[PDB]
Point group: D2
Chain length 249, copies 4
Amino acid sequence: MGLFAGKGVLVTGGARGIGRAIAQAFAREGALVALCDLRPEGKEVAEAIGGAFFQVDLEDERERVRFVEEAAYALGRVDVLVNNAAIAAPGSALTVRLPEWRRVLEVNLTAPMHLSALAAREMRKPGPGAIVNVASYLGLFAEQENAAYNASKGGLVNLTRSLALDLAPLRIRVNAVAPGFIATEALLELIALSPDPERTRRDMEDLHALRRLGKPEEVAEAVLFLASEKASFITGAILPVDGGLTASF
Amino acid sequence: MGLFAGKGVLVTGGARGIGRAIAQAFAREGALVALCDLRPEGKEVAEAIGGAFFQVDLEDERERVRFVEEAAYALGRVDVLVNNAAIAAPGSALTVRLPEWRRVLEVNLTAPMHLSALAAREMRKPGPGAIVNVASYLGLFAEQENAAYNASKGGLVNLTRSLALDLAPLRIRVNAVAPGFIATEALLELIALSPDPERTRRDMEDLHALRRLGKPEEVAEAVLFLASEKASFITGAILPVDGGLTASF
Amino acid sequence: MGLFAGKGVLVTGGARGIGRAIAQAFAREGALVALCDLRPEGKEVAEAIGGAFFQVDLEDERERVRFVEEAAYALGRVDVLVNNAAIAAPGSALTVRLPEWRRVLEVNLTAPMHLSALAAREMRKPGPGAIVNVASYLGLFAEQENAAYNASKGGLVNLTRSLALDLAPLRIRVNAVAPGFIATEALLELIALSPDPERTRRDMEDLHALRRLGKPEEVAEAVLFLASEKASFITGAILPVDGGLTASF
Amino acid sequence: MGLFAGKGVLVTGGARGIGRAIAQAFAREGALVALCDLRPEGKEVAEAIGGAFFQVDLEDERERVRFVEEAAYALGRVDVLVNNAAIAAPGSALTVRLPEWRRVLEVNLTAPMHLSALAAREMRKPGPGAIVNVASYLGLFAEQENAAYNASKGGLVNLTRSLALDLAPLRIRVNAVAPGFIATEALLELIALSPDPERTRRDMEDLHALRRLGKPEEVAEAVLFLASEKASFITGAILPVDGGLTASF
C-alpha cells in the first residue's frame, strides 16, 4: 500500500505550504498522518488526505505535550516526526523587540527539541523511527533584518546533530532539509505586493543555479526520502533543497 | 517497470563495493546500466544484471572518451552518470611520490570532470540528466598519511558545485554523496589483516552515531534518490551517508 | 601605548578562564576594560589590570541594559564588545528540563544579541567598532548529553553572521572564535572529578592535531586579532582555535 | 626589531598583488623574505624590502626543488612558507581544455603540496614553523565558467587540513586564508576594461557585507597573524578575508 503504509507520521505547520505538501506526500505513500497548525483550515487538509488535525499553538509547552499524546492515541503508533512549523520577527538586533525574538526561538528551536523528546518516547515501542527538521538556507547563512530567524535556524541545524547523537541508541535517525526559495502562498503574496512583482521573482529565480523557484512538493520528496528506510545510514545530515542557491554567489 | 525504466546509466568502478551496489540498484529499477572497471570480473556483474561491461583505465583520457561513446552506443541513450571509481596513494606530503599524487588527481578529480563533460553532451538529446559523484567524509576533512585522497576529494566536492552551475542550462543536476566507513570487500580485507580485527572494527563502528559500518546498498539508495526526478530541486548538494560520523567527536 | 590604547572594551565572564585572559590581553595593549561576571572575585581581576568590574546576571535584560550604560559611563567610550559568558544544562533533549534549556538560550544566544544592539548604539559615536563572540567547536558539531549548549552555540554562530550583515553599515565588524578544549579552571575541575583524570585529559588532548589542551591566552590572541584594525576586511567569520580538532576525526 | 625578526619567509607570486603585500608585510616585521614569481619585476620588490628574488615557474617540479634550496641558502633558515601563486583556465567542464586544467592543478594544488614538503624539511632545524595557503571564496563555492580554479582551490582547502594533521608532529602549523574580491592591479584592469566600469565595481562591492573591495594589505595582515606565534593554537583553519561575502547572498 506504499512506502509509509500503516506508519504514524506527525507534521507541524501542515495547513499550508511545505507542511501541507509533506502531509499530502506521506498520505500518498499510505501513512496515518496527524498534522497540527494554529490555523483552523488545517481541518480541511486532514479531511482531504484521510488524516487527523489538531489545533496547536507550539509556543505553549502544555499544548505540545497534548498534541503528541492525542496524535499517538489517534494513529495508534508514532514512526516519523516532521518539525516544519516556523515563525519570523522582522528586524536586525538593533530593531527587533525581545519578546518577539523570544517567541521565534520558542517555536523555531525550543518546540522542535521538546516535540522530538515527546515523539521519541512513542517511537521506542515498534521498529525504527525518524525525525526530519525543515530549516532553510537561512540556518547556514544570514540575510539582512532577520536576526531571530537566522539565529533559530542556526540552532535548529546544530539541534539536528545533537538529536542524531542522543537518539541513535533508540534506533531514531534525525536529519534536516534546508530549502531555498519555495513558491508557497506566503512567498507568492510577498512577490505580488512588491513594487515590480516580475522583477522581484526574476531576481529570486536568478539566485538559484536552476533559475526557478522550488515547489513545496520538491521539499516533501526530500523529507519522505530522509524519513524512509532507504536513508537507513543517513543521520545528522543537513540536505539543501535549494536548486544550487548555496553552491554559488 | 521501475524508477529508471529505459534510462541509460553509466557507473565507474562498477566491479565491486559501492559501484557494484549502485549498478545493481539501477538495474533493479529497470535501468540500462553500462559499468566500467579496470578489473575484468566486471563482465560477470554486467551479465548478472543484464547490462554492458567495458574494461577501462580512467587514468587514460582516450580510454574515457572510448567508454562514453561505446556505452551511449550500447544503451542507445545517456540519462545518468555516477563517478564512483577512486584510487589512493598512502603517505603525507613528506612521504608521497609526485607521480603517485598526479595519478590519484587524474583518476579522482580530472576523470570525473572529463566524463561529466562527455556524458553531458549525450544527456542533451532526450529529457533531463543527472550526475552523482561519490566522494567520502575524507573530502570535507583529513586523515593522517592520505594527502592525495584528501586533496582530490576536496577538489571533487567543489567540482560538484562547479558542474551544478555550469550544467544547469542543459537541464542536468549534479550532486555528491560523502560516505562514512562502508563494509566493502576492501575495508573487510583491511580489518581482517589488522593485528586485532575485532578491536579495529569496534573502533571504526564507535566513530558513527549508529555504531556500525555502512552497507554498499545504503550508499546506492542515496545515489538513486539524487539521480531520480524526486530530487528535481536538489543540485550542488554534498549529502553525507556516514551514520552520523561527521556530526560528532 | 599599545594596539587598543584608550579604547573601551566590554568583556562578559571576565572573572576566570578565557574571559580573564581576554580582559588581561586587552589591558596589556592599553585598553580601558570593563568586565562583568556573577563571581565577586571579578573585582580583583579589574583592580589588577586597572579596569572596571560589574557584578551582572546576563539572564536579566534590565541587568544587561544597566551593564552597558554604566560601563560606557565608567570608560567614557565603547569600541569593542566580547560576548564570552556562557552556561550549559547537561542532558539530551530526553533528559533536559525546559526552564534549564530556556535559561541557556537566554544567556548564550539572547544576551549576546541584546548586548550587541546596546554596545552598537555606543560604538556609533567615535570611529569604527568590533564585536567578537566566543563560541566552541560544539556550535559546528554535537556531543552526547549537551543539547542546550549545542543548540545555543549553533545559534551564536549564525547570529554572528546576522550581526555582521546588519551592523556593517555602522562600520562594526562581527566575528566569532570556536575554541577546542581549553585548560581553564572549569575544564580542570571536570578532568579532576572524572574516574581516571589522566586518561580523560589524554583522550581530550588526542582529539587535537597538536595533541595538547589550548591555553586561555591563545584564545585571547585570536580575540585581540579579530577586534583589531589588522582584521579590517574580516567580518562574518567563524575562526576555529582548536589545534586542528575540527580538521579531522 | 619586530614580530618575524630574523625569520626566513618564502612567498610565491611575490611580484604583484597579495604576494607583494605579504612580502612587504613580513619584511616590515623584520623577516628575511625570499620571494619567487615568473615576472622579472619581482627583483624590484625584493630590492625595495631588503630580501631575495628568484625567477621560478612553479609548474616545473625541478624549478620548485631549486627555489627552496637556493632560498634556504640565501636566508640561512626557513621558518614560514606562503603558497600564494595561482593561475586559472576560463571555462566550464564543457569548454575547458584538459592540458589547461592539468596546468592549473599542477600550479594551484601540486606545487603547494610539493613546496610544503620541501620547506617542512628545512623547518625541522630551528623551533616552530608555519605554512599559510592563499585560497579564495572560490575554494568553498563555485562561479560559472571557472571549473579548474574551483576544483584546485577545493583541493587546496582540504590539502591545508591534511598538511595540518601530517605536519603537527614536526611543530608546523598550516592554515589558509580565503579572500573575497581584492583590489589588485589585475582586478582593477578587469573592471577598467568592462563596458560600464563603475556598474561592474558596484556589483562586486555589493556582494560583501562591507560593500567595498578588500586591499592586498588586509589579506597580508591575516597571513602574518596565522604565521605568528599569536596563532599557536590555530592549525587546519580556513579563515575568510572577504568582508562578509561568504556569510550571506
